[PDB]
Amino acid sequence: EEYAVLISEAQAIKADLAAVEAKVNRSTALLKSLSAE
Amino acid sequence: TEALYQVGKEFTSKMDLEKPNYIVPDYMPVVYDKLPQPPSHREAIVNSCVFVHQTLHQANARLAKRGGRTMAITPRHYLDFINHYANLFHEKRSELEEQQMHLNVGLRKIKETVDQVEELRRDLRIKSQELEVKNAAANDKLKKEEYAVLISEAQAIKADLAAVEAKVNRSTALLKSLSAERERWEKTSETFKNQMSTIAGDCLLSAAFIAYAGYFDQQMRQNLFTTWSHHLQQANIQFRTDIARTEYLSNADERLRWQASSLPADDLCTENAIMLKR
Amino acid sequence: KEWIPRPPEKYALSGHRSPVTRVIFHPVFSVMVSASEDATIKVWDYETGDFERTLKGHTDSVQDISFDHSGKLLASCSADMTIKLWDFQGFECIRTMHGHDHNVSSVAIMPNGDHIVSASRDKTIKMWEVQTGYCVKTFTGHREWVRMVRPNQDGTLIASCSNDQTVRVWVVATKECKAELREHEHVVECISWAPESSYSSISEATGSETKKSGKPGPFLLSGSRDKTIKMWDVSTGMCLMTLVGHDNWVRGVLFHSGGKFILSCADDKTLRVWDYKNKRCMKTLNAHEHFVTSLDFHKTAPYVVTGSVDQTVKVWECR
């Protein structure tokens, strides 16, 4: 019962990890575009 | 008297001054001799204007008899009186119409708000039932990879439900805040039709006060205003007897600005400032 | 004469801060008057598209406006339960008639120029005097909201269209519904009758037989939300032809000044001009990006104007 809750918390943490990784990649692309500036 | 009546008719001809349910009093204060026996509302208004002009002559005669000093009452005084009457009528009618339009827009916005709040109620119950079925399916199927996906979607739906609940309580807090505003606007909108009925008499009194009662002291100003109000009452012309002339002819911002200019905080001083303005 | 609006526009007049409800032409002057939902009536110059002035006396949304034969007065109705008479020389409200409960929908002045007719949600039609302002006789018989009302060319016959599926024609003298028409598929919304220039043009279009007097009799036109425009006979009350092809709800219908084509708008966002004698000219003209509300045809000038919900009034050349 609580086991499904804990695996759902793991799914939450992996969704947050994916969002953070996407943000990091997007910002890295942004800085790579602003090198000349 | 005939010249004054004709001038009043011709000048105040583009003003509404029409009351379909006007009731002719049994004893009409006939000022103009050739006034029609069943006078209309406009004719009563012009007769009241002529009565005001002659009341100024009576006041001057009284002051001369008492040994006081009087100023000549000329037809230019009557011309200023009717000009002020027209200007005040137009200004007050425009202000009242604009205020009522704004209030109607506000009430329509509030009604759309409550309708969208009910729509949020139904959206909330739909979201709750979808969450119930989703977590029921997740628990059933987990009890026998994609199953973690199902429970993650269930979690996302709970998060959306929490955001929707925040919107619920926030919109409800806003909705209850505007309760005093909505009720006061409803009362004002219901009283809008009554206020339009009293524009003619109030504007007549205010124009007479501005054009005529400037030179006299407080006692004579009050006597003239009382005489005009009694004549309007005898002629069945509606006017508000609750508001003050200073409050009617000026707004609080202008009064506050005048006090900043070292204007004494007096009713007579306020009336003098209004006359210096209008 | 054979005027027909063209896809190119001349000016896109946008001054209203709320959807435009009706647009009309001044009888004599080169003046366009548009009534919108922001309680304001705006005056334009259709020849050069210059804003002239606004009439902001109304409280709630203005629904319908109408001139008289001389164009010397402007009668307006609004949702604030009142009818305002505008003096077009000074552009000031001169008489505000009260009563006629709930949202007033339509207003019109007979060619006599002495009395006014109006429709509202209160399922009745009232009759007013322009000189005094007293409702002397009240018309009853409609069982629902009445949308539009239009008189004849001599101030004797009046028809009113309502949500109750009935387009019923009335008389000034005996106050009786001589013709009652309940046959539309859904709600009728707009009506307009036939000028004398088109009485002869109906005979070969429908094959109707002349009576003993020889006059074809007054005709009737009524557009209904069922996407159909149908032109009727007032004297008898039978259908003559049904015009089908409007994509969405129809909003306004009228006849070409020459009395040869049919020109009407609808909620299909397009202006459609149709031929009824030969079913030939089926031009469809996109007019507005959003729903089109009202329209009018100039009696002599080659100009047509359309009012829409997209806050704009548009003027089309006629060619």
Please name which of B57, B87, B91 lies closest in space to residue B74, comparing C-alpha atoms.
Answer: B57
Question: Using the beta-carbon criterion (under 8 Å), do B152 and A4 form an inter-chain contact?
Answer: no
Distance from CA of B125 to the nearest CA of A (A): 23
**CA end-to-end distance (rounded Å), chain A:** 55
Question: Using the beta-carbon criterion (under 8 Å), do B154 and A15 form an inter-chain contact?
Answer: no
Please list every residue in chain B whose beta carbon sits closer than 8 Å to the beta carbon of residue C133: 18, 20
Q: How was this structure determined?
A: cryo-EM
Distance from CA of B190 to the nearest CA of C (A): 12
CB-count exposure of residue C258 (10 Å: 0-12, 13-18, 19+): middle
Q: How far apart are CA B16 and CA C132, in angstroms?
A: 11
User: Looking at the complex, does the CB of residue C290 fall below 8 Å from at least one CB of chain B?
Assistant: no
Question: How are strands ordered across the β-sheet holding C250-255?
Answer: C250-255, C261-266, C270-275, C282-286
- Where does residue C15 fall: left (phi above 0), alpha (psi -120 to 50 degrees), or beta otherwise? alpha
B-to-C residue pairs, Cβ atoms closer than 8 angstroms: 37
Question: Using the beta-carbon criterion (under 8 Å), do B18 and C98 form an inter-chain contact?
Answer: no
Contact partners, residue C95, CB within 8 Å, separation at least 6? B16, B18, C84, C85, C130, C133
Beta carbons of C89 and C95 less than 8 angstroms apart:
no
Beta carbons of C263 and C251 less than 8 angstroms apart:
no
Beta carbons of C317 and C302 less than 8 angstroms apart:
yes
User: Looking at the complex, does the CB of residue B137 fall below 8 Å from at least one CB of chain A?
Assistant: no
Question: Using the beta-carbon criterion (under 8 Å), do C59 and B14 form an inter-chain contact?
Answer: no
Please name which of C77, C86, C100, C97 lies closest in space to residue C53, comparing C-alpha atoms.
Answer: C86
> Quick one: how many helices (H) and strands (E) in chain A?
1, 0
User: Looking at the complex, does the CB of residue B152 fall below 8 Å from at least one CB of chain A?
Assistant: yes
Beta carbons of C117 and C125 less than 8 angstroms apart:
yes
User: Looking at the complex, does the CB of residue B18 fall below 8 Å from at least one CB of chain C?
Assistant: yes
Please name which of B91, B95, B89 lies closest in space to residue B42, comparing C-alpha atoms.
Answer: B89
Question: Both tokens of residue C143?
Answer: 């069982």
Please name which of C151, C275, C162 lies closest in space to residue C218, comparing C-alpha atoms.
Answer: C151
